[PDB]
C-alpha cells in the first residue's frame, strides 16, 4: 500500500525527519553498525542490538522506529546478489537510510544503489 | 519585547512589501545581536510561522524571509539552527495532514494556508550541497506530493481548489524536477484528479476547473 522507491535527499537527518521517523540502518554479523548508519544515531538506546547477536546475513532487528538489516561484507567475499537478497527481507515501508554498500570495506555506490532500487520500500537517502 | 520587534517588522513587511530589499540586512544584524537563546530562536520561528499561516498574502513574503534568515543568521544552538527549528515546526501540522484535510471548514481553511506556505517555502528555500549548492528542499518536494494526495483524497471543493492553487504555484517546478528524475508523480496526479472528476460529489464548476488543468499539465 506504500510508494515504490521514491529515493534521495540532500537535507540533514533532523530536517528529513519531517517526512518520517523510520530509519533503516546497516549492520554486520556481529551486530555492529557500519559507519554511515552509526552517524545516523542521535542518542538512541542500542543495547537491543547486542541482546540477540550474533546474526545471520538477512536478519532484521527493529526497536521503535529504528530498523537494522544484517548485510554481507564485500571485503569478505560478499556479492551484489547477496546484498539485494538481504535487503528484500526488509518490511516494505518509507525509510530514511544511507547507501548500504558504502563504500571502502564494502560494495560500490552503484551496487548499493542497485540493491536499494531492487527493494520494494520507499527510501530517503542521506549521503556519506 | 524581542518578540514585538519581530512582529513589528512582519507587520511593516505586510504594509510595505517593497521595503524588504532595503530593510532586510538591518533585520538580520539586529537579530544576530539579541537572539542568543534556544527559546528566543524558537520564538522567532513561531512568530514568522504564525504570520505566514494565519495572515493572507504572507505565504510568499514569509517563505522569502525564512530562506534569508536560514543562511544569514549566525546563531547555531545545539537544539538546531533557524532552518532546522523552522522545518521541525512544519512537521507538526504536516503529521496530521490526513486528519486536517477531513476536518471541519475552519480546520481545512487553516490547512490550506499551511499547504500554500509550504508551496512557497519549496520554491524559495535554497539548500547548499557538498558539490551542487543550487538545490531545492527535496523533503518539501515529497511533502507537497503527499499534501496534494491528501487534498485529492478528501475531494471537497475547498480542498480541491487549494490543490489547484498549489499546482498553479509549484506545478511547473515540480513537473521539471519529476521529469528530470524519471518519476511519474505528475501522471499519478493527473489520474487522481481524473478520478475526482469521475467519482467525487463536488461542484460542476470545480470539476470543470480540474479538467482545464488536464489540458495545461498534459
- The C-alpha cell at B144 is 507537497
A26 by Cβ neighbours in 10 Å (0-12 / 13-18 / 19+) ranks as buried
Expressed in Å, this structure's resolution amounts to 3.5
Beta A66-70 vs A94-97: how paired, if at all?
Answer: unpaired
Count Cβ atoms below 10 Å from residue B142 Cβ, excluding itself: 22
Among candidates B129, B130, B139 on the partner chain, residue whose Cβ is nearest the Cβ of A19: B139
My answer on whether omega of the bond before A103 falls inside 30° of 0, hence cis, is: yes
CATH tag, A13-125: 3.40.220.30
Gap from A7 CA to chain B (nearest CA, Å): 10
Straight-line distance from the first to the last Cα atom of chain A, in angstroms, rounded to the nearest whole number: 30
Residue of B nearest to A12 (CA): B84
- Burial string for B15-26 (b: 16+ CB within 10 Å, else e) reads eeeeeeeeebee
How far apart are alpha carbons A62 and B164 in whole angstroms?
40
Q: Do A8 and B138 touch (CB under 8 A)?
A: yes
Chain A residues whose CB is inside 8 A of the B139 CB are 9, 11, 15-16, 18-19, 124
DSSP state of A119: S
How far apart are alpha carbons B111 and B5 in whole angstroms?
28
Largest alpha-carbon pair distance within chain B? Answer: 57
Going from the C-alpha of B89 to that of each of B12, B53, B63, B188, the distances in angstroms are 24, 12, 14, 29
Residue of A nearest to B84 (CA): A15
Residue of A nearest to B183 (CA): A6
Residue closest to B13 by CA, chosen among B65, B70, B82: B65
Chain A residues whose CB is inside 8 A of the B90 CB are 18
- The C-alpha cell at B11 is 507587520
Going from the C-alpha of A87 to that of each of A76, B74, B168, the distances in angstroms are 18, 42, 39
B112 by Cβ neighbours in 10 Å (0-12 / 13-18 / 19+) ranks as buried
How far apart are alpha carbons A103 and A76 in whole angstroms?
14
How far apart are alpha carbons B60 and B44 in whole angstroms?
18
Residue in the block written with cell 530589499: B21
The domain locations on chain A are 13-125
| Phi, psi (rounded to 5 degrees) for A45 | -75, 110
- The C-alpha cell at B38 is 534556544
Going from the C-alpha of A84 to that of each of A90, A101, B101, B196, the distances in angstroms are 10, 10, 38, 39
Chain A residues with a Cβ under 8 Å from any Cβ in chain B: 6, 8-12, 14-19, 124, 127
Neighbouring residues of A78: CB distance < 8 A, sequence distance ≥ 6:
A71, A72, A106, A107
Residues of chain A by 3-state class (helix, strand, coil), percent to 5: 25, 20, 55
Chain B residues whose CB is inside 8 A of the A65 CB are none
Q: Do A17 and B91 touch (CB under 8 A)?
A: yes
Chain A residues whose CB is inside 8 A of the B87 CB are 11, 14-15, 18
Residue of A nearest to B143 (CA): A19
Count Cβ atoms below 10 Å from residue B147 Cβ, excluding itself: 25
Going from the C-alpha of B112 to that of each of B14, B31, B95, the distances in angstroms are 20, 30, 15
Per DSSP, helices labelled H in chain B are: 2-15, 20-34, 38-54, 58-72, 82-95, 97-100, 105-124, 138-153, 157-180, 185-199, 204-217
Chain B residues whose CB is inside 8 A of the A127 CB are 130
Neighbouring residues of A61: CB distance < 8 A, sequence distance ≥ 6:
A27, A31, A48, A49, A52, A55, A67, A68, A69, A70
Amino acid at each position: 500500500k506504500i510508494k515504490a522507491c521514491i529515493d534521495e535527499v540532500t537535507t540533514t537527518l533532523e530536517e528529513t525527519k519531517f517526512l518520517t521517523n523510520k530509519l533503516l540502518l546497516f549492520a554486520d554479523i556481529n551486530g555492529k553498525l557500519y559507519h554511515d548508519s552509526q552517524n545516523m544515531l542521535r542518542g538512541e538506546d542500542m543495547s537491543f542490538l547486542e541482546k540477540d547477536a550474533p546474526y545471520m546475513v538477512g536478519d532484521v532487528i527493529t526497536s521503535g522506529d529504528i530498523t537494522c538489516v544484517v548485510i554481507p561484507s564485500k571485503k569478505a567475499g560478499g556479492t551484489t546478489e547477496m546484498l539485494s537478497r538481504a535487503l528484500k527481507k526488509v518490511p516494505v515501508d518509507e525509510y530514511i537510510t544511507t547507501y548500504p554498500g558504502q563504500g571502502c570495506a564494502g560494495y560500490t555506490l552503484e551496487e548499493a544503489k542497485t540493491a536499494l532500487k531492487k527493494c520494494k520500500s520507499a527510501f530517503y537517502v542521506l549521503p556519506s | 519585547t524581542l518578540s514585538e520587534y519581530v512582529q513589528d517588522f512582519l507587520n511593516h513587511l505586510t504594509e510595505q512589501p517593497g521595503s524588504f530589499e532595503t530593510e532586510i540586512e538591518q533585520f538580520a544584524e539586529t537579530l544576530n545581536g539579541c537572539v542568543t537563546t534556544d527559546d528566543a530562536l524558537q520564538e522567532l520561528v513561531e512568530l514568522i510561522y504564525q504570520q505566514a499561516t494565519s495572515i493572507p498574502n504572507f505565504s510568499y513574503m514569509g517563505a522569502r524571509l525564512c530562506n534569508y534568515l536560514s543562511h544569514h543568521l549566525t546563531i547555531s544552538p545545539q537544539s538546531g539552527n533557524f532552518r532546522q527549528l523552522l522545518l521541525q515546526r512544519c512537521r507538526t501540522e504536516y503529521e496530521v495532514k490526513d486528519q486536517a484535510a477531513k476536518g471541519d471548514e475552519v480546520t481545512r481553511k487553516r490547512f490550506h494556508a499551511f499547504v500554500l506556505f509550504l508551496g512557497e517555502l519549496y520554491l524559495n528555500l535554497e539548500i547548499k550541497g557538498t558539490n551542487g549548492q543550487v538545490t531545492r528542499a527535496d523533503i518539501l518536494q515529497v511533502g507537497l506530493r503527499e499534501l496534494l494526495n491528501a487534498l485529492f483524497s478528501n475531494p471537497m471543493d475547498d480542498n480541491l481548489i487549494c490543490a489547484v492553487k498549489l499546482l498553479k504555484l509549484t506545478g511547473s517546478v515540480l513537473e521539471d524536477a519529476w521529469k528530470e528524475k524519471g518519476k511519474m508523480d505528475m501522471e499519478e496526479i493527473i489520474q487522481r484528479i481524473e478520478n475526482v472528476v469521475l467519482d467525487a460529489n463536488c461542484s460542476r464548476d470545480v470539476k470543470q476547473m480540474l479538467l482545464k488543468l488536464v489540458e495545461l499539465r498534459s
